[PDB]
Design an enzyme around this catalytic site. Structure first.
Site, PDB file in Angstrom:
ATOM      1  N   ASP B  27      46.664  26.561  94.216  1.00 24.18           N
ATOM      2  CA  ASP B  27      47.494  25.459  94.654  1.00 24.18           C
ATOM      3  C   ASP B  27      48.659  25.162  93.721  1.00 24.18           C
ATOM      4  O   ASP B  27      49.686  24.785  94.308  1.00 24.18           O
ATOM      5  CB  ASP B  27      46.668  24.186  94.961  1.00 24.18           C
ATOM      6  CG  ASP B  27      45.670  24.318  96.092  1.00 24.18           C
ATOM      7  OD1 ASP B  27      45.685  25.279  96.915  1.00 24.18           O
ATOM      8  OD2 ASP B  27      44.820  23.372  96.103  1.00 24.18           O
ATOM      9  N   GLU B  50      38.600  34.738  87.846  1.00 24.57           N
ATOM     10  CA  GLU B  50      39.191  34.200  86.634  1.00 24.57           C
ATOM     11  C   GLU B  50      38.499  34.550  85.338  1.00 24.57           C
ATOM     12  O   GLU B  50      39.293  34.786  84.392  1.00 24.57           O
ATOM     13  CB  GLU B  50      39.537  32.698  86.628  1.00 24.57           C
ATOM     14  CG  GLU B  50      40.328  32.155  87.749  1.00 24.57           C
ATOM     15  CD  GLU B  50      39.765  32.004  89.101  1.00 24.57           C
ATOM     16  OE1 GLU B  50      38.628  32.442  89.337  1.00 24.57           O
ATOM     17  OE2 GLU B  50      40.578  31.416  89.868  1.00 24.57           O
ATOM     18  N   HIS B 105      42.319  16.834  94.608  1.00 20.81           N
ATOM     19  CA  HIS B 105      41.671  18.145  94.885  1.00 20.81           C
ATOM     20  C   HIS B 105      41.674  18.866  93.550  1.00 20.81           C
ATOM     21  O   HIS B 105      42.738  19.024  92.916  1.00 20.81           O
ATOM     22  CB  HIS B 105      42.206  18.979  96.054  1.00 20.81           C
ATOM     23  CG  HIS B 105      41.605  20.103  96.789  1.00 20.81           C
ATOM     24  ND1 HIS B 105      40.300  20.235  97.199  1.00 20.81           N
ATOM     25  CD2 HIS B 105      42.211  21.232  97.304  1.00 20.81           C
ATOM     26  CE1 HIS B 105      40.115  21.383  97.871  1.00 20.81           C
ATOM     27  NE2 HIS B 105      41.264  22.010  97.971  1.00 20.81           N
ATOM     28  N   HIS B 106      40.461  19.259  93.133  1.00 26.13           N
ATOM     29  CA  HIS B 106      40.305  19.973  91.839  1.00 26.13           C
ATOM     30  C   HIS B 106      40.412  19.101  90.609  1.00 26.13           C
ATOM     31  O   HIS B 106      40.822  19.547  89.523  1.00 26.13           O
ATOM     32  CB  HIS B 106      41.246  21.143  91.579  1.00 26.13           C
ATOM     33  CG  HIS B 106      41.553  21.926  92.827  1.00 26.13           C
ATOM     34  ND1 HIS B 106      40.604  22.618  93.535  1.00 26.13           N
ATOM     35  CD2 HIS B 106      42.765  22.116  93.437  1.00 26.13           C
ATOM     36  CE1 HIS B 106      41.212  23.273  94.532  1.00 26.13           C
ATOM     37  NE2 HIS B 106      42.542  22.956  94.508  1.00 26.13           N
ATOM     38  N   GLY B 394      30.215  38.640  71.512  1.00 22.55           N
ATOM     39  CA  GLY B 394      29.042  39.166  72.261  1.00 22.55           C
ATOM     40  C   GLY B 394      28.732  38.569  73.642  1.00 22.55           C
ATOM     41  O   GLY B 394      27.605  38.103  73.907  1.00 22.55           O
ATOM     42  N   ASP B 425      23.346  48.702  82.559  1.00 18.64           N
ATOM     43  CA  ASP B 425      23.062  48.385  83.986  1.00 18.64           C
ATOM     44  C   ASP B 425      22.998  46.879  84.135  1.00 18.64           C
ATOM     45  O   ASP B 425      23.424  46.355  85.179  1.00 18.64           O
ATOM     46  CB  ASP B 425      21.775  49.048  84.469  1.00 18.64           C
ATOM     47  CG  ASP B 425      20.571  48.699  83.642  1.00 18.64           C
ATOM     48  OD1 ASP B 425      20.638  48.068  82.570  1.00 18.64           O
ATOM     49  OD2 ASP B 425      19.424  48.932  83.966  1.00 18.64           O
ATOM     50  N   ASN B 452      18.581  51.941  82.267  1.00 19.33           N
ATOM     51  CA  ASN B 452      17.274  51.962  81.571  1.00 19.33           C
ATOM     52  C   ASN B 452      16.471  50.809  82.146  1.00 19.33           C
ATOM     53  O   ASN B 452      15.657  50.210  81.471  1.00 19.33           O
ATOM     54  CB  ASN B 452      17.508  51.836  80.066  1.00 19.33           C
ATOM     55  CG  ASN B 452      18.308  50.620  79.633  1.00 19.33           C
ATOM     56  OD1 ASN B 452      18.541  49.642  80.342  1.00 19.33           O
ATOM     57  ND2 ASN B 452      18.786  50.615  78.378  1.00 19.33           N
ATOM     58  N   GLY B 454      16.869  47.198  83.211  1.00 20.53           N
ATOM     59  CA  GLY B 454      16.807  45.850  82.670  1.00 20.53           C
ATOM     60  C   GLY B 454      17.411  45.749  81.305  1.00 20.53           C
ATOM     61  O   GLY B 454      18.140  46.610  80.818  1.00 20.53           O
ATOM     62  N   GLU B 458      17.126  43.040  74.482  1.00 21.93           N
ATOM     63  CA  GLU B 458      16.280  41.859  74.420  1.00 21.93           C
ATOM     64  C   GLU B 458      14.803  42.199  74.486  1.00 21.93           C
ATOM     65  O   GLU B 458      14.015  41.559  73.806  1.00 21.93           O
ATOM     66  CB  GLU B 458      16.596  40.873  75.552  1.00 21.93           C
ATOM     67  CG  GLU B 458      17.432  39.687  75.085  1.00 21.93           C
ATOM     68  CD  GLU B 458      18.032  38.829  76.182  1.00 21.93           C
ATOM     69  OE1 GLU B 458      17.452  38.751  77.262  1.00 21.93           O
ATOM     70  OE2 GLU B 458      19.095  38.311  75.754  1.00 21.93           O
TER      71      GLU B 458
HETATM   72  C1  LIG Z   1      38.127  29.389  91.454  1.00 25.57           C
HETATM   73  C2  LIG Z   1      39.291  29.186  92.386  1.00 25.57           C
HETATM   74  N1  LIG Z   1      40.346  30.037  92.283  1.00 25.57           N
HETATM   75  C3  LIG Z   1      41.377  29.910  93.128  1.00 25.57           C
HETATM   76  C4  LIG Z   1      41.415  28.960  94.095  1.00 25.57           C
HETATM   77  C5  LIG Z   1      42.636  28.922  94.972  1.00 25.57           C
HETATM   78  N2  LIG Z   1      42.367  29.371  96.426  1.00 25.57           N
HETATM   79  C6  LIG Z   1      42.139  28.446  97.325  1.00 25.57           C
HETATM   80  S1  LIG Z   1      41.905  29.097  98.874  1.00 25.57           S
HETATM   81  C7  LIG Z   1      41.978  30.695  98.272  1.00 25.57           C
HETATM   82  C8  LIG Z   1      41.822  31.828  99.226  1.00 25.57           C
HETATM   83  C9  LIG Z   1      40.448  31.935  99.954  1.00 25.57           C
HETATM   84  O1  LIG Z   1      40.561  33.110 100.804  1.00 25.57           O
HETATM   85  P1  LIG Z   1      39.453  33.372 101.913  1.00 25.57           P
HETATM   86  O2  LIG Z   1      38.107  32.987 101.239  1.00 25.57           O
HETATM   87  O3  LIG Z   1      39.782  34.713 102.354  1.00 25.57           O
HETATM   88  O4  LIG Z   1      39.570  32.204 103.001  1.00 25.57           O
HETATM   89  P2  LIG Z   1      40.512  32.272 104.399  1.00 25.57           P
HETATM   90  O5  LIG Z   1      41.406  31.166 104.326  1.00 25.57           O
HETATM   91  O6  LIG Z   1      41.030  33.662 104.552  1.00 25.57           O
HETATM   92  O7  LIG Z   1      39.315  32.292 105.430  1.00 25.57           O
HETATM   93  C10 LIG Z   1      42.279  30.657  96.946  1.00 25.57           C
HETATM   94  C11 LIG Z   1      42.477  31.889  96.097  1.00 25.57           C
HETATM   95  C12 LIG Z   1      40.337  28.050  94.100  1.00 25.57           C
HETATM   96  N3  LIG Z   1      40.243  27.039  94.932  1.00 25.57           N
HETATM   97  N4  LIG Z   1      39.263  28.188  93.223  1.00 25.57           N
HETATM   98  C1  LIG Z   2      27.403  35.881  78.889  1.00 23.77           C
HETATM   99  C2  LIG Z   2      26.080  36.157  78.221  1.00 23.77           C
HETATM  100  N1  LIG Z   2      24.907  35.796  78.795  1.00 23.77           N
HETATM  101  C3  LIG Z   2      23.766  36.193  78.168  1.00 23.77           C
HETATM  102  C4  LIG Z   2      23.737  36.971  77.054  1.00 23.77           C
HETATM  103  C5  LIG Z   2      22.444  37.376  76.406  1.00 23.77           C
HETATM  104  N2  LIG Z   2      22.260  38.917  76.387  1.00 23.77           N
HETATM  105  C6  LIG Z   2      22.532  39.653  75.358  1.00 23.77           C
HETATM  106  S1  LIG Z   2      22.208  41.291  75.575  1.00 23.77           S
HETATM  107  C7  LIG Z   2      21.605  40.929  77.180  1.00 23.77           C
HETATM  108  C8  LIG Z   2      21.091  42.050  78.039  1.00 23.77           C
HETATM  109  C9  LIG Z   2      21.939  43.286  77.933  1.00 23.77           C
HETATM  110  O1  LIG Z   2      21.580  44.114  79.027  1.00 23.77           O
HETATM  111  P1  LIG Z   2      22.073  45.588  79.219  1.00 23.77           P
HETATM  112  O2  LIG Z   2      23.527  45.397  79.434  1.00 23.77           O
HETATM  113  O3  LIG Z   2      21.260  46.181  80.328  1.00 23.77           O
HETATM  114  O4  LIG Z   2      21.794  46.392  77.865  1.00 23.77           O
HETATM  115  P2  LIG Z   2      20.746  47.444  77.219  1.00 23.77           P
HETATM  116  O5  LIG Z   2      19.653  47.606  78.168  1.00 23.77           O
HETATM  117  O6  LIG Z   2      21.472  48.727  76.904  1.00 23.77           O
HETATM  118  O7  LIG Z   2      20.282  46.761  75.915  1.00 23.77           O
HETATM  119  C10 LIG Z   2      21.729  39.633  77.473  1.00 23.77           C
HETATM  120  C11 LIG Z   2      21.295  38.968  78.716  1.00 23.77           C
HETATM  121  C12 LIG Z   2      24.994  37.291  76.483  1.00 23.77           C
HETATM  122  N3  LIG Z   2      25.169  37.930  75.344  1.00 23.77           N
HETATM  123  N4  LIG Z   2      26.170  36.902  77.106  1.00 23.77           N
HETATM  124 MG   LIG Z   3      19.827  47.985  80.471  1.00 21.52          MG
END
Ligand SMILES: Cc1ncc(C[n+]2csc(CCOP(=O)(O)OP(=O)(O)O)c2C)c(N)n1
Ligand SMILES: Cc1ncc(C[n+]2csc(CCOP(=O)(O)OP(=O)(O)O)c2C)c(N)n1
Ligand SMILES: [Mg+2]
Ligand SMILES: [Mg+2]
Lengths: 537, 537
Positions: B27, B50, B105-106, B394, B425, B452, B454, B458
């Site tokens: 907006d 975002e 709004h917002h 991290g 994964d 691997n 999960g 951890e």
């Molecule tokens: C997190 C976030 N980012 C951006 C917006 C801005 N925004 C509002 S409507 C919209 C598009 C939604 O598109 P769609 O879900 O395709 O709905 P349509 O109108 O096509 O059915 C965006 C990007 C928002 N409200 N919140």
């Molecule tokens: C945003 C966020 N949420 C949670 C965590 C906690 N965290 C650290 S490592 C991990 C799991 C990593 O998983 P994966 O990517 O599968 O790695 P691998 O199996 O190789 O250790 C999580 C949940 C984090 N660091 N950041």
């Molecule tokens: Mg893993």
């Protein structure tokens, strides 16, 4: 006899009926997490991300009453703020528990352990950093009570050392007081008496239920107020679902100047307005504003008179106060779609009108910010329909996580309740991963995706063919199997006959499996109200 | 000639060589986004969310030097914060432009338009909310300058009514000055003199290149220091890529107890450590620490002495002061993997050792937090290799976003340069939608996913079979086609001979298309040292 503070928490949530816990594991919450599995009936959702987990805790709270999300310090808590901010804005009770470093990495590199905490405080009703196991129990009880009663997020920081510290088990035998404190006798009576007086002389009273009629548990009451007075009843977009729509006195969705003329007319016509309303987002002077913690009658304000108890008490008298009211005609419901050949392309206008024929009592209907949210106001709901639309926050992507939360909550209240989502193709992209969590738990929501190739609502406001309003085209019907869904169904609908054939099918009507429905629609297609609204904005 | 304020922004950005802008439309930013297409060489990436856009901005910045992310008031800026906090924590210059309402709004429903600005102020070097066109150009300049010199995120709030107001085009003719202020002459003289003194009496001095050796401009100054002194040089995990690993004086990765024993000894036995750009971790006496805004010699701090000036003056006399130095031998590099049957299952200790055969000079290598970031430290890089490891902040899904941003930046530098990601994964799940943006731009990274099953990092520390460490299983190879990819390759690898066969292939080694390589590994498998640490815990 003692229990770990970590189990105290989970036992308190079981008592408040928060049976599912949202969030992700991390460095500072592993020992908390372990405690969920020691509490019979508790479950950890396993979200695909912290933003999605918060959208979910919102969805769950909307339905069950309150929710709980648990994140880890820094990294987890900061990812969830957009969800939290939206529950603040819309009055959704979410308890955000953050696992933090033990009294004394994932930091800003400056030894500041309070910064994430300070950020959260701007979007919390209250916050707590647990420092002593002595007060600790009372602090959890406080946070839980407050989240419930103000219907706003609360922040609770829990240092890793404390979780395994012990508390007296005995404290769980006394329930947390989850009820409103009674009203000041005298002000409450004055409000009641004035309203009664006003109803007596009004010739054309109207009831208007908004956001907070739902958000602040007053629907049974508003509902009966209508039966006892026979006054026309209108709902706003955010309050849609607050009032049974097959009620013979329901007059439609009031959205000011953007209102279908007769609705506009019938509402602006009143000599009395009983608003079981919300915010001052913007006829007569004879308006009664009902609010969670205060009343307003014309220019008179009455601080701390809670609408709950005034409404309850009015029901015992209002009928005799309205014995004299000659029932005004309510605007007729929009007529059904004229029959057409099965090969007719699906258009939004026809769709939203036709949707009232597939919906059923008890369904939970979620519409995302976009064409969907505008359209849903045009559908007539069967009675006892729970609608979710983020009109005020309007964070796109919210509905996928919320759908997960509402399905979890709905599975707990009744396994037959259907959860139906209408999501734009653009909005889906932000939170698509949460579908993975739906699969893992065997939830069975109806996921309707509005394929119209880009951001239609945006294109209708600015830059119709601007590159930024365009999206990468995904193969939506492959999403389910890609996330490892085993038992699911995929459908594509592009005409009215495909719409009918699918939505009238008996089998389709039973929530026996998760399902994705791709809706093929034209790019510049929109419901009459968005056509007419946004055009001007 | 006069130009729009909105266009002026993008012409400045392009002056400091930002050609790709990240973020999502909303907006309050539509009119500013229109301005990107009036500027030749600039591009809107079209991010799937975002948070993912903030992560990409971070990766772009690591490569190009600075980046820009544009979001919209409330919904959009709030979603990016975890990204922005990470850029702050790790010293990444990201400029976050937020489109704000019209100076009319917002929101949280309370009339307070500053709450979000205020939240971000805590994770920003400086912040600006533009309100006057007469002052705007200078403010934009100040924020760009600050972002670039401090290498920290800046918040720039831009009301929608101002971006369309005109400014004199003549302003862009005088470039933004990035020059640093000189140091206090006596403190600086004091530092220089003391360091040369220490160098003169050192028998076994070593160079340590850390995290901000690269983002802080000094990679050139550091290399000259190595050549001029012949002292053994080591990197920390965050600084890997900062020194060319094929240099005869390079001795390895200094991790703590986790390093190769020959490496642990070599660093630990030094009587003088010359530590450049430490954010740090870490017998070790004479430690000189070079920081962008301060020096540290042993226990004495010299606040305000910028390392920049100190390094440039030291390069004039260092060879003299070290002329008595008798070159110590550096630790020998890890021997090649012994031959095994082609059938042998893939193990990480083997894999990270083997990966060095696949890499080539000019590669960009990114490793996510989890086992991959521990393992990467065991890989030997060819000369001129950039490593991206988010060691301090991290945030587990960072790398899918980082990859999109380093891919766009590399492309702008040299399209033949390869971008290679190592992701678990479990982390891909938090940010998987950003693969979609890579497809839309025809970017061609190597996406290696460690399957691997999960969260093994951890599981190795707490709850080996705790439900919260498991995840929904996805069909990894179907992600490319689900996101509309057209030109791509997918591959699965489970054994030694499979690895070799794929990685030694010449067509494989060419970045002609996006690729996904799924790697099957045992659940408790990890880098050995990591496994041994693990059990005594
Ligand atoms: C997190 C976030 N980012 C951006 C917006 C801005 N925004 C509002 S409507 C919209 C598009 C939604 O598109 P769609 O879900 O395709 O709905 P349509 O109108 O096509 O059915 C965006 C990007 C928002 N409200 N919140
Ligand atoms: C945003 C966020 N949420 C949670 C965590 C906690 N965290 C650290 S490592 C991990 C799991 C990593 O998983 P994966 O990517 O599968 O790695 P691998 O199996 O190789 O250790 C999580 C949940 C984090 N660091 N950041
Ligand atoms: Mg893993
Ligand atoms: Mg759309």
């Amino acid at each position: 006899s003692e229990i770990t503070l970590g189990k105290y928490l989970f036992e308190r949530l079981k008592q408040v009926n928060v049976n599912t816990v949202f969030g992700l594991p991390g460095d500072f919450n592993l020992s908390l997490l372990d405690k969920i599995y020691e509490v019979e009936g508790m479950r950890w959702a396993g979200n695909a991300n912290e933003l999605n987990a918060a959208y979910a805790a919102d969805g769950y709270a909307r339905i069950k009453g309150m929710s709980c999300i648990i994140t880890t310090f820094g990294v987890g808590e900061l990812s969830a703020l957009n969800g939290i901010a939206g529950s603040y804005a819309e009055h959704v009770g979410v308890l955000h528990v953050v696992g933090v470093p033990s009294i004394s990495h994932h930091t800003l590199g400056n030894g500041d352990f309070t910064v994430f905490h300070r950020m959260s405080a701007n979007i919390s009703e209250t916050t707590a950093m647990i420092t002593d196991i002595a007060t600790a129990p009372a602090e959890i009880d406080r946070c839980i009570r407050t989240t419930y009663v103000t219907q706003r997020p609360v922040y609770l920081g829990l240092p890793a050392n404390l979780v395994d510290l012990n508390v007296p088990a005995k404290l769980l035998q006394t329930p947390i007081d989850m009820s409103l404190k009674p009203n000041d006798a005298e002000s409450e009576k004055e409000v009641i008496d004035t309203i009664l007086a006003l109803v007596k002389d009004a010739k054309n009273p109207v009831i208007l239920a908004d956001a907070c009629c739902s958000r602040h548990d007053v629907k049974a009451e508003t509902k009966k107020l209508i039966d006892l007075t026979q006054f026309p009843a209108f709902v706003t977009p955010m309050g849609k679902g607050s009032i049974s729509e097959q009620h013979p006195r329901y007059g439609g969705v009031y959205v000011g100047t953007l209102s279908k003329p007769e609705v506009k007319e019938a509402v602006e016509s009143a000599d009395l307005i009983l608003s079981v309303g919300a915010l001052l987002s913007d006829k007569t002077k004879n308006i009664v504003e009902f609010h969670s913690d205060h009343m307003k009658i014309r220019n008179a304000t009455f601080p701390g008179v809670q609408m709950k108890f005034v409404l309850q008490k009015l029901l015992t008298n209002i009928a005799d106060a309205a014995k004299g009211y000659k029932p005004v005609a309510v605007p007729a419901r929009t007529p059904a779609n004229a029959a057409v050949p099965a090969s007719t392309p699906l258009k939004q206008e026809w769709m939203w009108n036709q949707l009232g024929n597939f919906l059923q009592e008890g369904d939970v209907v979620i519409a995302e910010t976009g064409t969907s949210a505008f359209g849903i106001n045009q559908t007539t709901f069967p009675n006892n329909t729970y609608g979710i639309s983020q009109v005020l926050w309007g964070s796109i992507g919210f509905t996928t996580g919320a759908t997960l939360g509402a399905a979890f909550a709905a599975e707990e209240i009744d396994p037959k309740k259907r959860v139906i989502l209408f999501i734009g193709d653009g909005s889906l992209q932000l939170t698509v991963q949460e579908i993975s969590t739906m699969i893992r738990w065997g939830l069975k929501p109806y996921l309707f995706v509005l394929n119209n190739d880009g951001y239609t609502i945006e294109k209708l406001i600015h830059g119709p063919k601007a590159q930024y309003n365009e999206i990468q085209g995904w193969d939506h019907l492959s999403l389910l199997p890609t996330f490892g869904a085993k038992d699911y169904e995929t459908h594509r609908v592009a005409t009215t006959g495909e719409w009918d054939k699918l939505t009238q099918d008996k089998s389709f009507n039973d929530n026996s499996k998760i399902r994705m429905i791709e809706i093929m629609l034209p790019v510049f297609d929109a419901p009459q109200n968005l056509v007419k609204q946004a055009k001007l904005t």
